Structures are given as structure tokens and as C-alpha cells.
Design a protein around this motif. Sequence first.
Motif, PDB file in Angstrom:
ATOM      1  N   UNK A 149      10.935  -0.651  -0.731  1.00 39.57           N
ATOM      2  CA  UNK A 149       9.859   0.249  -1.158  1.00 39.57           C
ATOM      3  C   UNK A 149      10.083   1.699  -0.716  1.00 39.57           C
ATOM      4  N   UNK A 182       9.417 -11.916   9.475  1.00 33.50           N
ATOM      5  CA  UNK A 182       9.214 -11.143  10.725  1.00 33.50           C
ATOM      6  C   UNK A 182       8.115 -11.423  11.499  1.00 33.50           C
ATOM      7  N   UNK A 210      13.920 -12.407   5.697  1.00 36.27           N
ATOM      8  CA  UNK A 210      12.446 -12.338   5.016  1.00 36.27           C
ATOM      9  C   UNK A 210      11.803 -12.331   5.924  1.00 36.27           C
ATOM     10  N   UNK A 221       0.774  -0.993  -0.012  1.00 28.29           N
ATOM     11  CA  UNK A 221       0.081  -0.116  -0.077  1.00 28.29           C
ATOM     12  C   UNK A 221       0.779   1.294   0.001  1.00 28.29           C
ATOM     13  N   UNK A 222       0.842   2.002  -1.151  1.00 23.93           N
ATOM     14  CA  UNK A 222       1.335   3.430  -0.985  1.00 23.93           C
ATOM     15  C   UNK A 222       0.769   4.445  -1.471  1.00 23.93           C
ATOM     16  N   UNK A 223       0.389   5.691  -0.897  1.00 23.07           N
ATOM     17  CA  UNK A 223      -0.337   6.865  -1.203  1.00 23.07           C
ATOM     18  C   UNK A 223       0.445   8.160  -0.971  1.00 23.07           C
ATOM     19  N   UNK A 224       0.265   8.913  -1.758  1.00 23.52           N
ATOM     20  CA  UNK A 224       0.915  10.263  -1.689  1.00 23.52           C
ATOM     21  C   UNK A 224      -0.341  11.028  -1.514  1.00 23.52           C
ATOM     22  N   UNK A 239      -0.978 -12.113  11.867  1.00 22.92           N
ATOM     23  CA  UNK A 239       0.073 -12.836  10.928  1.00 22.92           C
ATOM     24  C   UNK A 239       0.547 -13.858  12.033  1.00 22.92           C
ATOM     25  N   UNK A 277      12.536  -5.240   3.215  1.00 25.04           N
ATOM     26  CA  UNK A 277      11.552  -4.986   2.174  1.00 25.04           C
ATOM     27  C   UNK A 277      11.018  -3.774   2.273  1.00 25.04           C
ATOM     28  N   UNK A 316       3.859  11.181   2.156  1.00 22.52           N
ATOM     29  CA  UNK A 316       3.540  10.004   1.472  1.00 22.52           C
ATOM     30  C   UNK A 316       3.629   8.594   2.333  1.00 22.52           C
ATOM     31  N   UNK A 317       2.390   7.775   2.404  1.00 24.97           N
ATOM     32  CA  UNK A 317       2.372   6.620   3.378  1.00 24.97           C
ATOM     33  C   UNK A 317       2.921   5.369   2.765  1.00 24.97           C
ATOM     34  N   UNK A 318       3.498   4.431   3.506  1.00 26.89           N
ATOM     35  CA  UNK A 318       4.207   3.357   3.203  1.00 26.89           C
ATOM     36  C   UNK A 318       3.911   2.228   3.909  1.00 26.89           C
ATOM     37  N   UNK A 319       3.104   1.163   3.501  1.00 25.13           N
ATOM     38  CA  UNK A 319       2.372  -0.033   4.343  1.00 25.13           C
ATOM     39  C   UNK A 319       2.576  -1.325   3.779  1.00 25.13           C
ATOM     40  N   UNK A 320       3.266  -2.332   4.272  1.00 29.22           N
ATOM     41  CA  UNK A 320       3.482  -3.473   3.652  1.00 29.22           C
ATOM     42  C   UNK A 320       2.625  -4.410   4.326  1.00 29.22           C
ATOM     43  N   UNK A 321       2.681  -5.770   3.772  1.00 23.04           N
ATOM     44  CA  UNK A 321       2.088  -7.006   4.333  1.00 23.04           C
ATOM     45  C   UNK A 321       2.655  -7.427   5.758  1.00 23.04           C
ATOM     46  N   UNK A 322       2.847  -8.721   6.017  1.00 21.25           N
ATOM     47  CA  UNK A 322       3.423  -9.088   7.018  1.00 21.25           C
ATOM     48  C   UNK A 322       3.948 -10.512   6.994  1.00 21.25           C
ATOM     49  N   UNK A 323       5.223 -10.678   7.751  1.00 21.45           N
ATOM     50  CA  UNK A 323       5.815  -9.875   8.820  1.00 21.45           C
ATOM     51  C   UNK A 323       6.363  -8.537   7.922  1.00 21.45           C
ATOM     52  N   UNK A 324       7.150  -9.057   6.762  1.00 29.88           N
ATOM     53  CA  UNK A 324       7.635  -7.796   5.921  1.00 29.88           C
ATOM     54  C   UNK A 324       8.883  -7.202   6.605  1.00 29.88           C
ATOM     55  N   UNK A 325      10.076  -7.585   6.416  1.00 29.86           N
ATOM     56  CA  UNK A 325      11.212  -7.373   7.317  1.00 29.86           C
ATOM     57  C   UNK A 325      11.379  -5.763   6.927  1.00 29.86           C
ATOM     58  N   UNK A 326      12.468  -5.189   7.826  1.00 31.31           N
ATOM     59  CA  UNK A 326      12.621  -3.870   7.584  1.00 31.31           C
ATOM     60  C   UNK A 326      13.213  -3.625   6.335  1.00 31.31           C
TER      61      UNK A 326
END
Lengths: 100, 250, 1045, 50
Positions: free
Chosen positions: D40, C231, C229, B12-15, B74, D36, D24-34
Amino acid sequence: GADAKTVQDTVTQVIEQNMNGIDNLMYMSSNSDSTGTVQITLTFESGTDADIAQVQVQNKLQLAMPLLPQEVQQQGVSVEKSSSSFLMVVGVINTDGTMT
Amino acid sequence: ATRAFSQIKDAMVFAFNLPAIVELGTATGFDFELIDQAGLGHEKLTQARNQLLAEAAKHPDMLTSVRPNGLEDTPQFKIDIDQEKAQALGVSINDINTTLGAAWGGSYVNDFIDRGRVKKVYVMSEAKYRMLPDDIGDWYVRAADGQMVPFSAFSSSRWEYGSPRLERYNGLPSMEILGQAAPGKSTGEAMELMEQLASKLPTGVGYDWTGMSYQERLSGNQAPSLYAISLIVVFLCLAALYESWSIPFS
Amino acid sequence: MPNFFIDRPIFAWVIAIIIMLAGGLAILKLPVAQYPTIAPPAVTISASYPGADAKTVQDTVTQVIEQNMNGIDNLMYMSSNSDSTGTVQITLTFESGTDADIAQVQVQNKLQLAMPLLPQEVQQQGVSVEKSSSSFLMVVGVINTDGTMTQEDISDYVAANMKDAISRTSGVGDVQLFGSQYAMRIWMNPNELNKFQLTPVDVITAIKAQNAQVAAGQLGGTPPVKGQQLNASIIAQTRLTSTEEFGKILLKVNQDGSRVLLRDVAKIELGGENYDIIAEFNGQPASGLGIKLATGANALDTAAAIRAELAKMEPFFPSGLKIVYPYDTTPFVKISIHEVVKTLVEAIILVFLVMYLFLQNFRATLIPTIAVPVVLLGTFAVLAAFGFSINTLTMFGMVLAIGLLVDDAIVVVENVERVMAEEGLPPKEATRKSMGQIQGALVGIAMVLSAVFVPMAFFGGSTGAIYRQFSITIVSAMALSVLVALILTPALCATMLKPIAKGDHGEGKKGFFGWFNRMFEKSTHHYTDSVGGILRSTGRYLVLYLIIVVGMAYLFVRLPSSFLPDEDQGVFMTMVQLPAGATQERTQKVLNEVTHYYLTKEKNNVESVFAVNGFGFAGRGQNTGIAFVSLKDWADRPGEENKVEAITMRATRAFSQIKDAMVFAFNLPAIVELGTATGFDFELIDQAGLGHEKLTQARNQLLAEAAKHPDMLTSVRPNGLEDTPQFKIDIDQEKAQALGVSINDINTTLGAAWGGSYVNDFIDRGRVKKVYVMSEAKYRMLPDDIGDWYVRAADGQMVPFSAFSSSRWEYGSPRLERYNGLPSMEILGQAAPGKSTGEAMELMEQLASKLPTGVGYDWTGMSYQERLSGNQAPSLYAISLIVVFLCLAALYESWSIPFSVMLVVPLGVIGALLAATFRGLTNDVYFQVGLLTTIGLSAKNAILIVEFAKDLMDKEGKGLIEATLDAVRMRLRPILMTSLAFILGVMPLVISTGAGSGAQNAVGTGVMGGMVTATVLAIFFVPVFFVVVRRRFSRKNEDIEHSHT
Amino acid sequence: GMAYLFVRLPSSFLPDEDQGVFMTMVQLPAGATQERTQKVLNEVTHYYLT
Ligand code: NI
């Protein structure tokens, strides 16, 4: 080093329960993270004296403070009174390349 | 930008521009909160919410992009310490835990001074030995007799789901729900439907309106009593100035 | 400003309609309560050592918490109780007006100074510091109808679902749960522990190790090895959730192979945290919510905030859970103020009639009709903009005001109705000549009258707040009555009044009205001749007037005194106090006998009796009880007999039967902790280091000597409880060391088994609750049971308790007290039948002087302040009397003629008194404000006769004897009109039956009785007052005809 | 016609201003290490700069 349940069921809960008889409180809104973080956000009416509102919150925090784990009391719980969005962000970089 | 960032795989990425001030961005939709009003636990609220989210998507004409603001369960690494076998082997359950949580989570031991300033001392495992499931077995702890015992002796691990952002609203477990008011329809109506949709939910699960949704706003609600009396008020002082119940109309 | 508004009808109209709109909003947005918050702030600090004695809580918590209190502002006195229940309670009381919220903090600033000095076990339990009134607001019951759930369930349901929410709502200064949230409950079987060679210490340790939630990190946590990979959070032990889970805890493996789990040596049960409080609603099992009020609410608003917080909870309840309403000091406050408004309207319709009788014109009669609400409306505005709530007192103020309002309106209209009948001038012209003739009189009138009302806003203490509510509610009414008097009423006078041909007195037209004006115009002529004749005779009356004064004064000192009158509040309470120890059961027996009476002998009036064993106003214990009793609806209880004054009476007389039990039925103090009525609060102090027994004795000796004066002191008693046998157990340390047992192991198994020990929390259905271990009750009921418990020496041999312990009986207190940091014992009692509080004290200050060396005393609570008529008030009137006299001198330009008015004052006061004495009624707050209004109205009545009299000398040249009566006949109608309007106007108050009548009758009778005598005596005595003051003072004058500038 | 224009006009509170600075927002899945996430954050940081 806590899980999201072990922070909610051992800190967040014992800190929301000891909150009461605190004035003008519109709603309380806690998150709890498998990061090992709590964050309870009491929101008071408009016009409310922010400074009185700040105290009453903590009056009832210490009611709860020797009931949180030893390891959490060490780290130091903190009770602020503050807007969410930042004001300014001040950067700090090294030009001469000497420091990571 | 946001159109470009949509490329990114699994992210998810938004500006977005700043709300125009403070937390004075009570603009942009609503903030619907769901509540475990009985003692229903976590999984059931997940489900209740899944079922609300799932049913809100089925009304593209007065509700859109209805989503949770949080994060989803998770895999977690549950480790069961078989106490008996630990007692049987002669290891303190205090020694065990402290070496687990120490090595893997880290432990603020006690302060020290660094150049005229007090700073903390944290012990923890070098990252090589706390990166992977099979690494659990590498740590040893010391029974009363003196023999170091492996972790696999008395621990049995296993995967399991669970949340990384357990929420609570007003003391009760909750899950937060954001979303917008469809193109031509207001906030007020988009809510009305959300107050109905949440009614067909399971027994125990209820709801409330937090944040931007708690208050409501302006033209639609009240303002019209302001002008309405303001219209009368003006009419009085006109009557005053002119000495006429008619000429004020002019 | 009249003849500008006389020429601008509409610009007037606008003003009124703006004050109407203003006040109309102010009615909506303003708080609705019974009285103003007159309570000192009452910050409070509540601790609880679980399983402690009264000395071990006082000497280990209470003392270390009173000592760390200092440099805390405005603190009037600190007042700690300490209970062999294991409770502390220190109650710091701050000055009036004190910011309750600052007062709350400063208290705790100094609490934490002390917090890591209290025991570990007390800090766990959680000390609590509230800021809250003592008396409850409402009590919300919770019962189960469908029979599925016991009282321990109901308690818990609410405890864990209902209270947590309620406690957080603003206004709620403290919620006391009637009953307790659940608690995993390990009940220890000692015989079994010994068999398996284990102690509570093992059991406590076992729980702590196995019911724990541990923190243990992450897979791939920060910092990672480069290229990680995954976490994920790691989870280890998590809290136990169930009886079963605790049940199978492991205590030890036998070297046999055998296993010994917690269930093998204890009954595991979801049970109460504590077990002392047990409630019953109409005898059916019940729990509920006993709610207080944070210093300085906030109206019904707080009880209004509730069904919000409650009614959101009514859908998620289980089968048969039914909320109920056994106690509510709200429906009264609503049906009190609302029945006042009703009388306001009545007072309006009556006046209109009395207007219509006299001036017989459907429009004219609408003028003063229109005038009132406008002004009234306007007042709530001024009130709003000052900071006064729409309260019982203020609402009376408003009904009283009608008089001092309605009057103004009449005069304006009447005098024009006069002028038109006397010169022939058209309405517009006539009112000009009219209004520039009474103008400066009406303005002065508002000043000499506010010179009686305002000083009442000042001031003394708790009682002073109440007067203020009136001063500013009345004077507001006044000045607005005057603004209205000069903008709306004249405006309306010129436009609205139909013309009256020169010399038309309505004598010859129609049936009734034609008759009335025939008898009235005759009457005023008999009236004038009657005055004309008594002017002849220099007051034979003068004597008769002083006689009236003499007699006034007798009636005054002959009338008893009060503050505010007990009202039936549809709900009262009954006290229950047993001997000692006096098990929970014995009290329940008692609570039944009480609950029986209200239900068997008193069905007709009683609706519901929420009763509660193990809770006491005073405090906690098996020996105490209390019953909240709710009556049926007022209307379904007609007659004295069926009101509370009678019901409590009749009950308390019945309960006197009960053997070995103090039981009293008593009405509610009439409000808040605003029952500074009922006697005193004498506190004794161990000022040296005298210890406990000697204060007992000192007090015994004071109590004993106070009983020997039945003629100025009665029923002098301690408010506390007496020393009851305690079980002292001496641990012979040497022998314990000799046998090889830890003194830590010993104690922990004693206090554990007998007192109980909060071990550590667990989760019960998404909520954290406590785990308490304790002995199964079979093995902790009796002295010889001590010997049954065993503990484990170093070698391993379990040793009995009798080995190293020697028990024995001993006396000691279950309610060790302390006043201002020092040990004390509190002493209540009344002021003998005919003698005051002030004197009853004087003697008590002497009797306490013949006590032993070391012992001293002080006056707390109701005795600290004192009250009203006797102390100060007389300086209020005294200056008010001077203040009025100044503005009279002002209006008249005379150091003599002012007297002419003032001397009316005692003509209403005679009546006010008569009506008061002849109705059993008392001299109480309401009476007084009535009295004032009465002296106000009478002043006005005189003032205008005199005023007018003067004008006919200072404009014409008519000797006092000529101008005074020519004045009197000119003024008589309006005097009768305002007077008959108001005498009738208040008639509703002096009749009122049920609900708030106590006040309304007080407000009423005094005013009416006062208003009647007043307006028949002033009508004859004022024209004397004038002439005598006119003839006594002055020197080159005529007493005859002068004439013309 | 005034009234038509009135109900025909959409509603707002206060208009977004350009404030010379946004986020700007940035949100990954999980666990999704530092790591990854850093990948992004780069791709984003790249765009604004390229
Ligand atoms: Ni005659």
C-alpha cells in the motif's frame, strides 16, 4: 509481547487508579494496544504550569510503579509533557550504499 | 490525491493538509466518547456503539460519516494450558509460560555493551517457527524427570475474537466516536442530536464530549457580549468627549 | 480635580459607570470562600505494612522514610505516627506562602531515595504522598433504600464507581473511603490444610500461578518470513473474574487420582479488602466519601466541582442506591456571606432614610445613595486585581466601610446644602465655592486614616493573613470613596441639587419636617452656647478626659481575649475512644449509645448522624469511633438552648455516664485547620538513644508533676494511647531447623493466617481489585489457636506450631510516635482559667527540665506560633500612631495641632469597650478591625471640626475661641448625619440571630457602642482639644481679631 | 441588508494555509501483515512520484 487486555488489565488500569489528587486535570484518555503499549494522556487547564502538571502526574505514577509487572518496569515507563503534532522530521539515509 | 487513492482495494487511504497549526486544529467536527458506566465489559460497548453508529447513519440531514476512531476486533489465538495435565506430566507452569512468551513474544534478558554503549539483549524464536498455529506444537519444555514434552500434550488452542485497541476514558472503558456536522448545520446542533441518539441506548452505557467538543469556539456563544459591552463602553467615552447623551449616537 | 468634573457632569458619570462595570465583572469571576487559605501547607506521606506491629512499621518503614528525607526546603518540622494497625504517617509542614506544589515534589524526590528500601509487601500496597489540610470538606453518604444491598456492597459500589472519579477532580487533596472496595477473599480453613498436608504457602503459590495474566506474543509477528499473510495476537492465561473461578484452582493431585481444589480448604468470597471501618447513617447501613482539601483551594469551587462528578453518576446507580448529605461546611459558607449582603442593602436603605430625615429632598437624598454602591462595586475590582477572595472577613470589611464611605458623601452634599443656605449661591456656583473649601481636607483624611488601616495588613503569621483581608478591603473602599468624592459627588452636587434661597433653613413649612428643622436649629444653638460656655472654663473636662482615659485602660485590660468566635455551623462532631484492645463490637455498643441520645433525647435539633466505627481523628483501630452529626435548619432551632454551644455541652455532660469510654461532643474549630485556639501541643523527645519505656516513664513523671499545679496548668494529658498486651511469639529456630521446616514457610503461614497477605490482583467486572488470603476468623481469635496451624518440613511431615514456637504476653505500644526523626510522645493541655498560654508554657518548659537525662522537649503545631495581642500588635498601632501624627502635621502644618485630633481616639475606644464588656463579648479579630474603624471615624469627625476652625483663622482673623465654635456649629449636623447613619447602619449586625451571628455581633456591637460614645464626646471634647493645643503652643498671637490678606 | 449579508456569511476560525508540506494516512484491515501495508505504502509513494 502482551495482548491488549493484558496491557490494559495489568498496566493501564493499575496506572489510572493510582492517579488522583492531581490538580487542574480536565480528563484522562488511555489507549491500550495488542502491540503491547499503553498511553494515558492527562490534559490540564489552559495556563496551567506545564512543569508542575508534569510532576504531579508522576508523584502518583510511583504510587503505582512497584505494582506494574517486573517485565514492564524493566522496559521503563516514561512520562513526558508534549504537544501531539511533530515539529520537524530529520531524515537519515546512506548514499554510498554501504549500510542497510 | 485522495480521489485517486480511493482506488485501493481493502485500505483506508487519505491525503490531508495540516490543521494550520499545533494541536490547534479544534476545527473539523467533534469527538464523541461513549462510556461503560456500569460494569458492562467490552462486547456490550461494541454493541451499544454499533447501535449508535447504525442509528446515526439514519440521519443524513444533520450528522454525517459518523464512525469509530479505533479499530475492530480481530481473531486472536487463545491458548489454554490444561494445568492438571501439565502437573500430571511434571512440567513447571513457570517453565511453560516463559518458553511460550519467550519464543513468540520475545524477552528482554539483560543489557550488554556495543561499542561503548549499553544496549539490550532480546531472545526470541527465529521467525520460521512462530508464524503459524501448527507451529505451537513444535516447542518443547522440560519436566522434572527430564523428558521433554510437546506443547500439544498440555495445550489446546482455538480462535477467538477480541480487541487490538481497548480504550478507556476517565478511568472507565470507552469507545471514541468522530464525525462531522452536516453541510448547513452547526456543531452545536449536530451534537444536540447525538446527545439524544445516545439516550435511546442500553442501560449502563453513557457518554461524554472530549477534545475539540469540550470547548466550542466563538461566534454563537459569547463574543456578542464582548461587542455588546464594547458598544456601551464606546458610547460612554463619546458621551465623555462631547458632553452629550445624544451626540455620541452621531 | 473637582471644578473640572463640576463642569463635566457626564465625563464624571462615565468614570463611575466604568468602576461599576469593572467591579460587577470582578464580583462574578472572583472566588467565594469563608476565609483566605491561612493554613501552612501540610504535605503528608502514608504507608501501610499489612498485618504489622507498631514497632515493625516504625522500625521498617517510618524510620527508613524519615532518614531519606533531607535537603527539602522550608520544612518547619516532621511529625510521624506509627500504628499496631500497620500504618505510618509522616507529616511534613512547610512555611506559610510556600509553593504547595513544589513542597509536594521535594517530599517525594526524597521518598524514592527510600522506596526500594521499604519491604516488598509495603511497596506492593503503594505508599502515597498527598498535600492536604486535615479537616474534611464535605462527607457524602451512600445508603440503600430498597434493602437489596449490605454495607460491604455499598462501600464497594462507590469504591469502584464513585471514588475513582472523585479523587481525580482538581482540589480534592485526599479521599478517605468509609468502607472498602471489594477483594477476592480466600478464608483459609487450617484443619483442612493439614488434612491435605498443605500450607498457606501452597495456597499463596497456587493463586499466583493460576490467577495470572501472561504475555505470549503474535502469529506472524515482526520480523516475519517474507510473504506472511496473517497477523494475530496470541492470548494465553487471562485473570480470573469470579469466586467460582478461584474456587476450582488446583492445589495438588493425590497419587490416588483424587483432586484437592482451593474451595476444599477455604471459603471463597467477594469481601472487603480491609474490615475495620464500618459506617451507619441514622443507624441504617452506609458507606460514603470523606473528602479533604488540597493545600490552597479554590472556593466552594471544589465542592461545586463535585455534583458535576457526582450528578453524572446518579443515573447509572442500581436499585435503591441513594446519596445523602450528612456533613457540609458549604451551605454555611453560602448562607453566611449571603446574610452579610442582606445587611449591606439594609445599611443602604437605612442611610437613605437618615439622609432623607435631615436633608428633606427626594433627589439630594439620592446623591449619597448613588455614591455608595459605585464605590463598593469599585472595591471588589481592586480586590480582584490584587488576589483576595470574596470572603467572610472581606464582606464585613465592606459593611464596616459604609461608615468611612457614607461619611465622605454626606460632607460633600451637606457642606453645599450648607453653603447654599448660608450665601444663596446657585447649586452649580455654590458647590464650586464649597468643594474648593473642603478639597485638601478630604485628601489628607484618606492618608491619616490609611495610616491606621494599612499597617494592619502587616502581618504576623496565621492571624496576619486575616487582618490583611481587611486592611486592603477597607483602604480600597477609602481611596475610591475619595476619587468618587472628587469626580462623581461634586459632579452630582452641581447638577442634582435643587437651589436653596439665601437663609432658608426649612423652619416654616409642612407638618413634621417643619417641626424637625425647628427643633434642630434650636438644638444646634443650645449646642453652640454649651460649647461656648465650656471653652470659657479650660477643661474641668480635661480632668474628666484623663479620667475617661484611665477608665478606658481598665476596661481594656479587664476585657478577656479571643481570636475568632465559634459559630454554629449547622454540623458538629462527637469523639469516641475506648480502652484496649476493645473489640470492634465494644465500640459499636458505644457508638449506639451515642447515636441513641441524639435520636431519643435530642430529636428536635438533630437531622442526621453519620457515625463510623474503626476510624478516629488520631487514627484507625477497633478501639476508635467518630460521629458526624448534622442538625436541622437554623430557623427550626430558635434559642440558645437549641444552638450547638448548648447542644454539645448538654450532650458531653450526658455521655460522661458511659462506662470505660472517653466520649466528647465538640463544635467545629470555626474553620480549616485554623483552630490554633484551645491550649497547646507540647512534644517530648528521646534526644539520646533512650528507647521507648524510658520516654513513657519520663512522660509519666511530667504528667504526674503537671497535675500537681492546678493553678496555672490543667487537664495535662498525652494525646496518644497507652501500651496494651501484645502476643509475642518466639520461633525457636534451632528446633525448627532440627525438625526440618523452612523459616520462610513458617513465617509466611503465621503472618498469612493471622495478618493476611495481598497475593495478586484479579478483575471484578472490568476493574482490577486485590486478592487477600487469610484465616477464616474461627481459627485466629485466640492464643491457643496458634497451635492449630501446621506447616511442612522437607521430609513431608506436617509439624504443629507448639513444636517450635513458645508464646507469651508482653506489653508494647499501638501508637509509637516520632517528632523530627526522633522518638517522641505528644502532650496536650490547656492554659489555666485566668492565666495565658505564654505562662502555662513557661512552667511546662521548667517542669520538663527536672526530667531524667536524655529526655528533652519542643513546641509543635498551635504552640509553635503564638498569636496576637501580647506579642507584637502593639508595635503596629504604635507606629500607626506615629504615622497618623505625621500626616496630621502635614495637613495642618503644625507640630501641635495634630494632637488636637489624635486625642479623640480614646473617645470611641471607651464605648467600643463598654458595649464589649456589657455583652459577654470578647476582644477578638472582628472587634479590633471595628475598633480601628471606630478610631478612624472619630478621627475624621474631629479632623474636620479642627480643619474648619483653622480655615476661619487662616482666611479670616478670628481668635480660636471665636472660630472654633463657629466651626463646631458648622460641622455638627454632618457629624450627627454620618454618625446616626452608621449607628443605625450597623444595627442589623448587632441584632442578627442564627448563622454567622457570632461574627456579625462582634463586628456590630463594638462598632455601634464605640460609634455612639465617640460622636457625643468628640462633639464636646474636640473644640476643647483644639483650643488647649492652640493656646499651649505658639507665642506672638492674638487670641483676638487679626484680619485680611 | 448589512444584517442579511452577516447571517448569510459562513463561519470559520483560521484558514488552512499551504505549508509546503502535508501528510497521507494509511490504514489496513487486520491482521494485515507488514508486507500488505508496504504494498500500500508503495502505491501511494508511486503516485506522488509518477
Ligand atoms: Ni444662645
